[PDB]
């Protein structure tokens, strides 16, 4: 996903 900057690299910045 697009790692925007988040905590895991395999989630978004959303995850909903």
Aim: proline letters at 20%; one cysteine or more.
């Amino acid at each position: 996903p697009s790692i925007x900057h988040v905590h895991r690299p395999d989630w978004p910045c959303w995850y909903r």
